[PDB]
Design an enzyme around this catalytic site. Structure first.
Site, short mmCIF file in Angstrom:
data_model
loop_
_atom_site.label_atom_id
_atom_site.label_comp_id
_atom_site.label_asym_id
_atom_site.label_seq_id
_atom_site.Cartn_x
_atom_site.Cartn_y
_atom_site.Cartn_z
N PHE A 172 0.74 -1.26 0.19
CA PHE A 172 0.21 0.02 -0.12
C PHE A 172 1.00 1.23 -0.15
O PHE A 172 0.34 2.34 -0.62
CB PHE A 172 -0.98 0.00 1.20
N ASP A 228 -0.40 -11.12 13.78
CA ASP A 228 0.38 -11.12 12.45
C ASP A 228 1.72 -11.44 12.86
O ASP A 228 2.53 -10.61 12.13
CB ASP A 228 0.07 -9.92 11.62
O1 LIG Z 1 11.89 2.77 10.38
C1 LIG Z 1 10.82 2.43 10.26
N1 LIG Z 1 9.81 2.57 11.45
C2 LIG Z 1 8.60 1.56 11.00
C3 LIG Z 1 9.17 0.88 9.97
C4 LIG Z 1 8.26 -0.04 9.26
C5 LIG Z 1 9.13 -0.75 8.07
O2 LIG Z 1 8.24 -1.52 7.25
C6 LIG Z 1 7.33 -2.42 7.96
C7 LIG Z 1 6.87 -3.59 7.07
C8 LIG Z 1 7.82 -4.91 7.60
N2 LIG Z 1 7.34 -5.96 6.66
C9 LIG Z 1 7.41 -5.88 5.21
C10 LIG Z 1 6.58 -4.67 4.49
C11 LIG Z 1 7.00 -3.24 5.44
C12 LIG Z 1 6.23 -2.13 5.19
C13 LIG Z 1 4.85 -2.34 5.22
C14 LIG Z 1 4.20 -1.34 4.89
C15 LIG Z 1 4.48 0.01 4.20
F1 LIG Z 1 3.79 0.80 3.80
C16 LIG Z 1 6.03 -0.07 4.04
C17 LIG Z 1 6.69 -0.91 4.53
C18 LIG Z 1 10.35 -0.47 7.55
C19 LIG Z 1 11.02 0.51 8.32
C20 LIG Z 1 10.48 1.13 9.47
#
Ligand SMILES: O=C1N=Cc2cc(OC[C@@H]3CNCC[C@H]3c3ccc(F)cc3)ccc21
Lengths: 339, 59, 631
Positions: C173, C288
């Site tokens: 998304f 999850d």
């Molecule tokens: O610095 C951070 N703070 C929250 C975070 C979240 C992150 O990714 C979360 C999700 C982890 N698993 C795979 C998909 C990742 C993700 C999920 C949704 C999104 F919009 C962008 C990335 C990466 C880095 C950071």
């Protein structure tokens, strides 16, 4: 019952009073004065325009010097004006915004005011370092302050929307005398020149004569159809004029104990806010809700003059002790001196 | 207001008001008129006073 | 592009604004960071009655954070002597009978838990609440508090408030960016979900849920969950400001590292457990739990990420088959079967197993068919390798029990039962929380590219945007902490030296007299009335609201104009050039527009104007001299 008997006796007593008054109505003031020369049209112009108040002016009062005058406005201030030059002597921020009445002391040392605060606030003008400050807050009325007049620097008389008037001892702040009797909001009072007597005008559509020293009502003048908003003594103190929401002014004699004259016209529907006599008492000046003050022949009841300047209601007027001029205060936030 | 004290106070007041000496309206009016004629010369709004006397016109 | 505090004159408005919500009590301001900070500054510098009471408060708060019983024994006797005994010896003790007796007893027995002074804390707060709170309110520290609180309540974030840097995540998304909040200079993660993608895939409730969820959780300062400080949106992007975690996720590192040892996975497990605990206290099931949703900071410590598929069970329980396949519990998968915390323990077991063997328990031989993966969960015990320790076994055995009746972490005491597992005998859980245990994998130099998972003919309408109406938000605790820890000190200092110059300038000028004092003024402060609209004429004036009128004035003068309450017919909220104004309608058909400097000012000026004009008019109506009549 006893209670029914006193309802009856008070009714028979009211007739005995009316009859006694009819018994003296042998002539009218208008018949008596039918002979004398009319006064001619009075032609006063606006000499001074006193600018300074930021809102509706509710009341004013002249100093005994026929020069300094105090005024109370919706802008929550009192201004003491030098009428001669238009210079403000003092502007006084009040502790309450809801001011209605102001007064100037005979000496010219204190001034008073009040309103919906329910308090007569006395202000010493000549403080020990040039300032002004409240010397006393006269508290006791359970209604708004409608009007107030000094007897001297140590005594003052107030009227109130609690249907009473009162005499105060300024030094101690006490309520010396209370003048119960009116059945409606008291709206105005005027002191007799002797100051042993005063009258009051009220929303019960009656006026009353009170003895200051004795603290009781001597006479009750009725006649008006509506609320009496203003009242002033004739210069000799044997008679007084009233002004009402009924669009009429009226003249009451004390010794005859009844109405002598009515000052009215079909082109005037709106109510009288203020009244004052000219120095000789020949002219009766009245301020109206149609923005004009009318000048009346007190003896013949003909309308003589009309002070037209203000853009809103004339809330108050006053003639000087030297009788040189007429101050008129107004809802248009201006005072004007007419001459 | 079924106050017996209050009723008494009204009655006795209406006596104070009733039992007084009144003069005839004609005598009252004559005295008023006699005042206005007496002090007509001492009333600037009634009679023309020169600018010299009047503290408002030319200052 | 720093924080600028409003002028001290802001208090008149703010004090009433807070007063209306009951937010001016000791309780409320003392339990706020900036509030507390200011309250002690008052007590410790500008007062002597309270100075000792607060010092005593603090030394205790420090005593709570002592890391050993050995340290506590020492500091306790010190604190008692210094603050309790000295005053007692003299006789002027300001505390109750029982309170002192409670403590001294535990001291003669050298058993000093970090709570022995709890009865004193409450009775310190008795002594501070009220009488001394009053003096603080009356002091200009409360004014300073009203200045910050105004900034707090006037936050409307946008992208331009962020210095945005490289991309550190990629989800279906949206994307995640490293960013700095220019304002204070704080490093954050910004999560940008494309609204157009959300509409396309129908994941609105999901995006909205995450926000709602994040807010239930982002208080309490939890080291092991990715928490929110702010949420906002542009016309086509949902933006979450989140904890920075720029060291990739486990699903990635696992593929680069290969499977982890028992000791390495032990570390991750401990930290995750605690983060589970936090959510489970706040009545939230994550639902999850996966290596992909566990991120690493620059040092190697972990946090649970992405709360899209979590859920609050406080009010009613959920019963839906939702989560990732291979990690769902029996009770979850089964539709028409309710559940709570339960699931995540099962999910934990599944993930931890993956850490050790590289695949899900119920995903051997890389079979994709997800229907039979579920079959292995309900009535089938899991088989475990010949090289797992006996302690690792009994953990995973207990974690993956099909029956919730006999599952580890679902017997009453919850997360404790799991911590009590002999797999974690070696751990000091306090020392886990303090993040003192060294991480097994520290992320690399060159950017990780380590948080990935596995078309447009689309508009956005009235009804689409209205979904994202309650979306924007700011967590007070978060913003106050961020401020407290960056600029709060340096700003107050700069502000103090500014206000003191204007006061010392005005002493020489002679302007220093307040028109509002000694009267019946309701409220005052700056607004800007519109003059000629075509000239962008806006005129900042200082206003004074009195019960019967509204005055205002310019630079170095009395009020020359005003507006009566009688004149005012309505007070309406209105918009001009994307600015919220008040619109007063006046008797003559005349209009009066006023811009405020902040939301709370607008909110309060509207209320108080409306209050005044209605009350004044009702009053005058009953006053023959003042009321209007037939003319
Ligand atoms: O610095 C951070 N703070 C929250 C975070 C979240 C992150 O990714 C979360 C999700 C982890 N698993 C795979 C998909 C990742 C993700 C999920 C949704 C999104 F919009 C962008 C990335 C990466 C880095 C950071």
């Amino acid at each position: 019952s006893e209670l029914d008997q006193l309802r009856q006796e008070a009714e028979q007593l009211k007739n005995q009073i009316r009859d006694a008054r009819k018994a003296c109505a042998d002539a009218t003031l208008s018949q008596i004065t039918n002979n004398i020369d009319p006064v001619g049209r009075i032609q006063m112009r606006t000499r001074r325009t006193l600018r300074g108040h930021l809102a509706k002016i509710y009341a004013m009062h002249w100093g005994t010097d026929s020069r300094l005058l105090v005024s109370a406005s919706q802008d929550g201030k009192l201004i003491i004006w030098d009428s001669y030059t238009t210079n403000k002597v003092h502007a006084i921020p009040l502790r309450s915004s809801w001011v209605m009445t102001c007064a100037y002391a005979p000496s010219g040392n204190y001034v008073a005011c009040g309103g919906l605060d329910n308090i007569c606030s006395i202000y010493n003008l000549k403080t020990r370092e040039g300032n002004v400050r409240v010397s006393r807050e006269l508290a006791g009325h359970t209604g708004y302050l409608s009007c107030c007049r000094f007897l001297d620097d140590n005594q003052i008389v107030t009227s109130s929307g609690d249907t009473t008037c009162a005499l105060w001892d300024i030094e101690t702040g006490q309520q010396t005398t209370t003048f119960t009797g009116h059945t409606g909001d008291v709206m105005s009072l005027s002191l007799a020149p002797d100051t042993r007597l005063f009258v009051s005008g009220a929303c019960d559509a009656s006026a009353k004569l009170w003895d200051v020293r004795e603290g009781m009502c001597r006479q009750t003048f009725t006649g008006h159809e509506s609320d009496i908003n203003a009242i002033c003594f004739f210069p000799n103190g044997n008679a007084f004029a009233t002004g009402s929401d009924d669009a009429t002014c009226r003249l009451f004699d004390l010794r005859a104990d009844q109405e002598l004259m009515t000052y009215s016209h079909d082109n005037i529907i709106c109510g009288i806010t203020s009244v004052s006599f000219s120095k000789s008492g020949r002219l009766l000046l009245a301020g109206y809700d149609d923005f004009n003050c009318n000048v009346w022949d007190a003896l013949k009841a003909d309308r003589a003059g009309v002070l037209a300047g203000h853009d809103n209601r004339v809330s108050c007027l006053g003639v000087t002790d030297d009788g040189m001029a007429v101050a008129t205060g107004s809802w248009d936030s201006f005072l004007k001196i007419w001459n | 207001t079924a106050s017996i004290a209050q009723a008494r106070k009204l009655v006795e007041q209406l006596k104070m008001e009733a039992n007084i000496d009144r003069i005839k309206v004609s005598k009252a009016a004559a005295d008023l008129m006699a005042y206005c004629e007496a002090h007509a010369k001492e009333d600037p709004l009634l009679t023309p006073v020169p600018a010299s006397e009047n503290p408002f016109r030319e200052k | 592009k720093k924080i600028l505090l409003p002028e001290p004159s802001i208090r008149s408005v703010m004090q009433k604004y807070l007063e209306d919500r009951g937010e001016v009590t000791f309780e409320k301001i003392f339990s706020q960071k900036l509030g507390y900070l200011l309250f002690r500054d008052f007590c410790l510098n500008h007062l002597e009655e309270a100075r000792p009471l607060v010092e005593f408060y603090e030394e205790i708060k420090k005593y709570e954070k002592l890391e050993t019983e050995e340290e506590r024994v020492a500091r306790s006797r010190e604190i008692f002597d210094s603050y309790i005994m000295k005053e007692l010896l003299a006789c002027s003790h300001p505390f109750s009978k029982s309170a002192t007796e409670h403590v001294q007893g535990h001291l003669g027995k050298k058993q000093v838990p970090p709570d022995l002074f709890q009865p004193y804390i409450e009775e310190i707060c008795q002594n501070l609440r009220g009488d001394v709170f009053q003096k603080f309110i009356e002091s200009d520290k409360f004014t300073r508090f009203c200045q910050w609180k105004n900034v707090e309540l006037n936050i409307h974030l946008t992208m331009n408030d962020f210095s945005v840097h490289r991309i550190i995540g990629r989800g279906g998304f949206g994307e995640v960016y490293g960013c700095r909040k220019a304002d204070t200079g704080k490093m954050y993660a910004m999560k940008c979900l494309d609204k157009k993608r959300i509409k396309m895939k129908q994941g609105e409730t999901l995006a909205l849920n995450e926000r709602i969820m994040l807010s239930l959780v982002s208080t309490g300062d939890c080291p092991f969950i990715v928490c929110m400080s702010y949420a906002f949106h542009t016309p086509d992007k949902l933006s979450f400001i989140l904890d920075l975690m720029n060291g990739g996720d486990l699903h990635y590192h696992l593929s680069q590292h290969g499977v982890f040892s028992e000791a390495d996975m032990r570390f991750y497990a401990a930290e995750i457990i605690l983060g589970l605990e936090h959510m489970h206290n706040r009545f939230v099931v994550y639902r999850d739990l996966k290596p992909a949703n566990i991120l690493l900071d620059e040092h190697g410590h972990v946090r649970i990420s992405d709360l899209g598929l979590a859920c609050d069970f406080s009010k009613k329980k959920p019963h839906a088959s939702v989560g990732t396949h291979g990690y769902m519990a029996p009770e979850v998968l089964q539709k028409g079967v309710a559940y709570d915390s339960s699931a995540d323990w099962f999910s934990l077991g599944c993930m931890l197993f993956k850490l050790l063997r590289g695949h899900s328990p119920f995903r051997q031989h890389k079979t994709k068919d997800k229907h039979e993966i579920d079959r292995m969960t309900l009535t089938m015990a899991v088989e475990l390798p010949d090289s797992f320790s006996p302690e690792l076994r009994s953990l995973l055995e207990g974690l993956l029990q099909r029956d919730v009746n006999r599952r580890l972490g679902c017997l009453g005491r919850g997360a404790q039962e799991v911590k009590e597992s002999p797999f974690f005998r070696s751990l000091d859980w306090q020392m886990v929380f303090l993040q003192k245990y060294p991480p097994p994998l520290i992320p690399p130099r060159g950017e990780v590219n380590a948080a990935d998972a596995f078309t447009k003919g689309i508009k956005l309408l009235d009804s689409d945007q209205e979904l994202y109406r309650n979306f924007p938000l700011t967590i007070s605790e978060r913003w106050q902490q961020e401020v407290a820890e960056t600029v709060f000190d340096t700003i107050n200092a700069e502000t103090d030296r500014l206000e003191a110059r204007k006061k010392a300038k005005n002493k020489q000028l002679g302007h220093e007299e307040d028109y509002a004092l000694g009267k019946d003024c309701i409220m005052h402060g700056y607004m800007s009335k519109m003059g000629n609209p075509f000239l962008t004429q806006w005129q900042r004036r200082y206003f004074y609201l009195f019960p019967n009128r509204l005055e205002w004035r310019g630079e170095g003068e009395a009020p020359q104009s005003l507006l009566t309450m009688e004149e005012i017919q309505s007070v309406e909220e209105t918009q001009i050039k994307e600015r919220k104004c008040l619109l007063l309608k006046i008797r003559g058909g005349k209009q009066f527009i006023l811009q405020c400097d902040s939301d709370p000012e607008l909110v309060q000026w509207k209320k108080e104007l409306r209050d005044a004009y209605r009350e004044a008019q009702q009053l005058v109506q009953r006053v023959p001299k003042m009321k209007n009549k037939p003319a």
